[PDB]
Amino acid sequence: LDKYSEALKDAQEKLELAEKKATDAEADVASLNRRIQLVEEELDRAQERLATALQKL
């Protein structure tokens, strides 16, 4: 029991840490997707503004 309880506190702690890693990694998948979309949007806008600048050119 102590071995299963301890194996568990460790599987569970490793899990909280892996889940945290996933949470933080996911927080970053999301922060990266926000930056990617902000930058892709600025890029598409740079390209819209470029197409416009080129049209205005």
Binding site: L17, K20, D24, A25, A27, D28, S31
Partner: protein, 56 residues
């Protein structure tokens, strides 16, 4: 017949290129406000562990 219109052209070009010049002066002496910034990010690269504070 060649000097008077020359002088008039000098005056007109002077006034126009000179308003252009006084404004281009402001443009050139200060080109810092038309710049930008790096805008770095910390991003909290530590998705392997948590924090000490009670809220965390």
């Amino acid at each position: 017949m060649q000097a008077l219109l020359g002088a008039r052209a000098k005056e007109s070009l002077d006034l126009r290129a000179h308003l252009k010049q006084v404004k281009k002066e402001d443009t050139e002496k200060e080109n810092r406000e038309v710049g930008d910034w790096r805008k770095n990010i910390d991003a909290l690269s530590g998705m392997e562990g948590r924090k000490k504070k009670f809220e965390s």
